[PDB]
């Protein structure tokens, strides 16, 4: 946490304090597809010639 | 129009070669399906010829040497040189169709269906020459005159080998015509039938003719139905 402190306001000694950071963030642990039941398949050769 | 028509049949001995055809019209063998299902009545099958051109590895561990044929795509046709025809091959073949993936007819599947095919050609490799067919014309009798019905025909007796096709007034008499197929004899003779059932009335009156074919002796036979006249 010190790091980003220290390279935040672009100097090695920072005066005694408390500075704003970043948020803590949470990477997704699953990428789920919900879709419908369908199986049917769309006549396109009908569509076309 | 869009049919498979079988060509190209003729006599084959033990010793030589003959070029059979598949004939495709309306649709072009260029980018089309041909299989050829081999069938022999009774039994299973088996599909062999493997000709999908372009000429790499694809061959069946059955027929190796044997089974040589080209294709020619511009002219809508496939040409069969069937070389070494074994004497053990009595099978009327028929080309066929398929269905592979990529047409609409599948965006999500396999394929596989045969769908349309031929008629198929009668080609025998006997070691024996060609025999004639003989044509009896079975008269109808007492009982098939007052029976309303009167039953008549020619019987094709004793020709080696197949095959003997039956027509009747050349095409003008369809109506009752019942084709009998031929008997194995003994002595490997065959002996097929072919009753029409008609009116007893037009018996005499109506000129019955029974065109008796045999394409590998090249015999074709007009034979006259009569009635028992002493």
């Known amino acids: 946490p010190l790091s980003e402190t220290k390279c935040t306001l672009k100097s090695f000694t920072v005066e005694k304090g408390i500075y704003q950071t970043s948020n803590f963030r949470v990477q997704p642990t699953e990428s789920i597809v919900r879709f419908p039941n369908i199986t049917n398949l769309c006549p396109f050769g009908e569509v076309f010639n | 129009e869009v049919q498979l028509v079988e060509s190209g049949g003729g006599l084959v001995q033990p010793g030589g070669s003959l070029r059979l055809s598949c004939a495709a019209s309306?649709?072009?063998?260029?980018?089309?399906?041909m299989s050829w299902v081999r069938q022999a009545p009774g039994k299973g099958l088996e599909w062999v010829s493997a000709?999908?051109?372009?000429?790499?590895?694809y061959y069946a561990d059955s027929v190796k040497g044997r089974f040589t044929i080209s294709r020619h795509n511009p002219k809508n046709t496939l040409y069969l040189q069937m070389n070494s025809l074994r004497a053990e091959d009595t099978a009327v073949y028929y080309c066929?169709?398929?269905?592979?993936?990529?047409?609409?007819?599948?965006?999500?599947?396999?394929?596989?269906?045969?769908?349309?095919w031929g008629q198929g050609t009668m080609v025998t490799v006997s070691s024996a020459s060609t025999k004639g067919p003989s044509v009896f014309p079975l008269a109808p009798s007492s009982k098939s005159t007052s029976g309303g019905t009167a039953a008549l025909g020619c019987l094709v007796k004793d020709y080696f080998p197949e095959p003997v096709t039956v027509s009747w007034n050349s095409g003008a008499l369809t109506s009752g015509v019942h084709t009998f197929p031929a008997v194995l004899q003994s002595s490997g003779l065959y002996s097929l039938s072919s009753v029409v059932t008609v009116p007893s009335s037009s018996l005499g009156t109506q000129t019955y003719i029974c065109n008796v074919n045999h394409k590998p002796s090249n015999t074709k036979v007009d034979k006259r139905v009569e009635p028992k006249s002493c």
């Open positions: 066929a169709r398929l269905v592979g993936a990529l047409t609409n007819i599948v965006v999500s599947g396999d394929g596989g269906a045969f769908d349309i």
């Open positions: 000709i999908y051109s372009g000429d790499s590895t």
């Open positions: 309306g649709f072009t063998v260029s980018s089309n399906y």
